[PDB]
Amino acid sequence: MDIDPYKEFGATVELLSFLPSDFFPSVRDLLDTAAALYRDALESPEHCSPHHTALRQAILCWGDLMTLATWVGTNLEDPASRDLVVSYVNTNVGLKFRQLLWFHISCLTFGRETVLEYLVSFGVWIRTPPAARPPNAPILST
Amino acid sequence: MDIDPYKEFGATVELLSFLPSDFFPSVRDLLDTAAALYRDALESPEHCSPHHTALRQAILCWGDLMTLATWVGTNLEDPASRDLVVSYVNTNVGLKFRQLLWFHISCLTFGRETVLEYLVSFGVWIRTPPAARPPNAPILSTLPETTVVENLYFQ
Amino acid sequence: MDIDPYKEFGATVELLSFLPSDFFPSVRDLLDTAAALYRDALESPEHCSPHHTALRQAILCWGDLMTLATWVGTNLEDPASRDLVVSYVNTNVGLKFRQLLWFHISCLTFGRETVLEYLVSFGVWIRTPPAARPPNAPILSTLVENLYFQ
Amino acid sequence: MDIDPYKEFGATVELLSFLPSDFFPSVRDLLDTAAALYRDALESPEHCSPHHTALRQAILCWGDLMTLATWVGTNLEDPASRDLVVSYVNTNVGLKFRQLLWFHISCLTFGRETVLEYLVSFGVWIRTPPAARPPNAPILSTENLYFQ
Amino acid sequence: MDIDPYKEFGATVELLSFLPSDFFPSVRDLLDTAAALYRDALESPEHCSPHHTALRQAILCWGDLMTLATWVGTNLEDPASRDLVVSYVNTNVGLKFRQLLWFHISCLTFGRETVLEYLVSFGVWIRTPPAARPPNAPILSVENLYFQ
Amino acid sequence: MDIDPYKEFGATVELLSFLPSDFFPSVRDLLDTAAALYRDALESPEHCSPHHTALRQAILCWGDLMTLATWVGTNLEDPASRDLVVSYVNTNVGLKFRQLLWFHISCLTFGRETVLEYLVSFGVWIRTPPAARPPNAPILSTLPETTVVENLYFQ
Ligand SMILES: O=C(Nc1cc(F)c(F)c(F)c1)c1ccc(F)c(S(=O)(=O)N2CCC(O)CC2)c1
Ligand SMILES: O=C(Nc1cc(F)c(F)c(F)c1)c1ccc(F)c(S(=O)(=O)N2CCC(O)CC2)c1
Ligand SMILES: O=C(Nc1cc(F)c(F)c(F)c1)c1ccc(F)c(S(=O)(=O)N2CCC(O)CC2)c1
Ligand SMILES: O=C(Nc1cc(F)c(F)c(F)c1)c1ccc(F)c(S(=O)(=O)N2CCC(O)CC2)c1
Ligand SMILES: O=C(Nc1cc(F)c(F)c(F)c1)c1ccc(F)c(S(=O)(=O)N2CCC(O)CC2)c1
Ligand SMILES: O=C(Nc1cc(F)c(F)c(F)c1)c1ccc(F)c(S(=O)(=O)N2CCC(O)CC2)c1
Ligand SMILES: [Cl-]
Ligand SMILES: [Cl-]
Ligand SMILES: [Cl-]
Ligand SMILES: [Cl-]
Ligand SMILES: [Cl-]
């Protein structure tokens, strides 16, 4: 099956890709923000919203991936190739989860339309060369 | 955070653990069934239901895990070590996803109540030694909400 | 082009794929059944139905594959590899034709909706581990005025 | 069973054989014409016509025959015996599929009666010796309901 | 993105591909025809039509492609390498622009629906073997009360 | 023939030249923005506007140049030269295409009159020596949909 996790939320993988990689916080900083803002809702027996349902699964999936990556790095054929599994996480699946976690956390905080407008505003601003770019980035606010 | 993926759906990790591991189809057989029964809804731009939203993420998460496991296994010279990665998937994260996929797929067809009643019925039947247990396992189906006498009375 | 031969019949290659390979009868047995049930219609100068048209072509296509396999094994090969090519055709493309012949024969015999519901029922049953699986498979089957008694 | 693929379409294998082998377009050109003129209909979930059903199957069957002949050519370790398989295909089943693809594509494009009348006209004209044969071939010239 | 340059003009890349490569004029002859028939319009500050807008860009793009292909051809030392590049251009982007320039020039000159009907007619005619093909290609182009 | 691709749009090559070369985004960033903002219109069977028709052709033309330059590079004997022809294209026509893609994308987003006024404003600002140049560049922004006069009229 070819599922786009953003599609039921009015976005697409291609649109999230318009943000540069270094826009996103780390997964750890995203997970700490999800707890600070939504821990009680995420841990409750209520659905709350489709964003909460999706965010719950993503949090648990990152736990699955890191447990697997930890086992690989620890019970290893080599020494110091641990650096290799880390690099794959940083390059590949870490970026996917930074996009996804940022998307759900921001939509819960600012609303989908505000988030998507900001995404396009920032993506255009950051691609404007510094010769022309206004000094302050667009603002994400309700 | 300590999130139980079943809690918003009226169940718990411990309850799903009551089914034995060899009750569940493989992840592959579950994913092929999810596609045969629900592909169009899963791929659509509509939420459809909280079970659909959760099932979408679980399908994608399995892809993430297998891609990671494949990259590791492919970049391993020792073929016995590739067999270690497969065995780790089979022993640990495969069973979690067999439980989770089975739960959402079955709930989407039969409803939470029927599924949880069946889970408990099967878990009790399979723990009964075979001399005492009827030869046929409990059946998974939604029981009629009313008797035939009740149905006819309200015609 | 990207033609799916099931699409005009309300199905897809991927849906037929949901049945395991060992569900389908052999090609020989499918061709025997097509003859026993439908020979006169298949040989008639009438279209009869889209299923009949498709089934005619499928039967002839299998004939083309077998004729080619045999001519290659007969005219050329040693006696030992006489059946080598027939063996490849049955291995690779046999499953595709077992699916296709089964679909049209069963649709003609039981109706499309009955067949498609049975297909999904069987695919779920067979993926249920035998610990939990009821012993009997799902069944493929199809189903006076008051004045008379006054 | 004895199935003639043309019988439900009002023709026969023997009638298509009345056209000389070099009358028919190549398989490549027939497949490109089916795509250029009918790709959307052939790929649609609608039956459209008995010709569409036959064309769908014939197109897919040709693909299978090509995979089979290729496997034969690759696994026949004698380079001369790969050459017999090719020439046999061109002489026998290649001609069968050129006939079949031509028939259905032409019926959809020019109309069934027009195709069948033209077929007989062309077959008579080409058998007329050049001492007597007019220089130009007969003329082939131009919703749909299908009874039994 | 997957942009088909013909889609906004009611055609597709696959349909233009139905014409054989030797149907099209050379690029030089297409560019001379665009100039002879449309130079003033193409050079004007008016849009004129979407065909003119597309044709302007295609003419300029071909110039860029030719400046590149020329630079490559001149700086190669081996005649077989230079012929590899010409052959690659002729088969690929050279053919694409012959198709594209022909399409817009002919739509402007003969009308769009005339062009599309003719394309399909020609593609079928040229695939008909010469044994059956008519010698000439397809053509591209009151009551009494009235007088009382 | 002497065709200026900007002439039917009320501009000229020389006017686009008034912007310095390091003003323009990279080709990759322009193509990413065209997709993010206009993919559906660009891929649709409608003309939409002369800017869309021109932008479609420019996108495809850059692709043609890159495909040819990439293929030629694959034939070069020295693997270190694999991108030599791609570099030649960027060096000789990269700026031309950055100008053209920027022009159509910005006109679709802000309107031709706004774009041309901004172009002149920026070109004058950047030529003002830094001793006198105010720190913030002119701003490129869409006109408001309704004027203050109209807003007050409907109060
Ligand atoms: O996306 C952002 N941050 C982020 C998101 C997450 F989902 C995280 F998990 C996480 F760690 C950080 C972001 C982007 C722009 C921005 F300007 C600010 S802001 O300065 O903080 N701010 C401005 C004023 C508003 O009123 C509120 C927010 C924050
Ligand atoms: O698909 C089946 N068989 C098949 C199909 C073909 F197209 C063939 F060519 C061919 F040889 C065999 C099949 C599947 C399930 C099944 F239960 C039976 S059943 O027992 O025979 N049966 C039950 C009662 C009904 O009333 C009638 C049929 C048959
Ligand atoms: O859980 C089961 N199967 C399963 C679930 C999934 F989520 C899968 F992905 C997958 F492959 C298989 C199961 C358990 C008991 C059982 F009896 C049957 S049954 O025989 O098939 N059956 C009975 C009648 C009903 O009406 C229908 C289904 C199936
Ligand atoms: O496409 C054709 N030519 C072409 C197109 C271009 F875009 C060119 F740039 C260019 F050089 C040549 C073509 C095709 C068939 C054909 F029969 C003729 S025709 O003889 O010339 N003719 C017949 C009567 C009509 O009324 C007028 C045209 C011309
Ligand atoms: O059978 C023919 N062509 C064919 C068929 C197919 F099924 C193909 F796939 C394919 F490539 C070519 C054929 C035979 C005679 C003939 F004169 C022409 S004609 O010149 O083209 N012509 C004349 C005027 C009409 O009005 C239209 C058609 C075409
Ligand atoms: O031309 C610019 N950027 C650009 C154009 C393209 F065509 C691209 F493809 C691409 F990547 C970047 C540009 C120029 C000045 C400027 F100030 C900004 S701004 O800061 O982003 N901004 C300000 C507020 C408005 O409201 C909106 C936009 C952007
Ligand atoms: Cl909280
Ligand atoms: Cl579905
Ligand atoms: Cl049982
Ligand atoms: Cl019979
Ligand atoms: Cl079509």
Author numbering:
A (entry chain C): 1 to 142
B (entry chain D), F (entry chain B): 1 to 155
C (entry chain E): 1 to 143, 149 to 155
D (entry chain F): 1 to 142, 150 to 155
E (entry chain A): 1 to 141, 149 to 155
Task: Show me the paper's own sentences about this structure.
The full length core protein Cp183 or its N-terminal domain Cp149 predominantly assembles into a T = 4 icosahedral capsid. Due to its critical roles in capsid assembly, pregenomic RNA packaging, cccDNA maintenance and suppression of innate immunity, the HBV core protein has been recognized as an attractive antiviral target. To identify the specific interaction modes between core protein and HAP_R01 or SBA_R01, we crystallized the Cp149 mutant Y132A, which remains as dimer in high salt solution and destabilizes Cp149 capsid.
In parallel, we identified SBA_R01, a novel capsid assembly modulator belonging to sulfamoylbenzamide (SBA) series through a focused library screening. For SBA_R01, the contact surface is 402.3 Å2 with 60% of the area from the B chain as well. The binding concave and cap of SBA_R01 pocket are composed of similar set of residues, except that L37, T109, F122 from chain B and R133 from chain C do not directly contact SBA_R01. Noteworthily, the benzamide core of SBA_R01 does not superimpose with the dihydropyrimidine core of HAP_R01, suggesting the dimer-dimer interface of HBV core protein can be targeted by different chemical scaffolds.
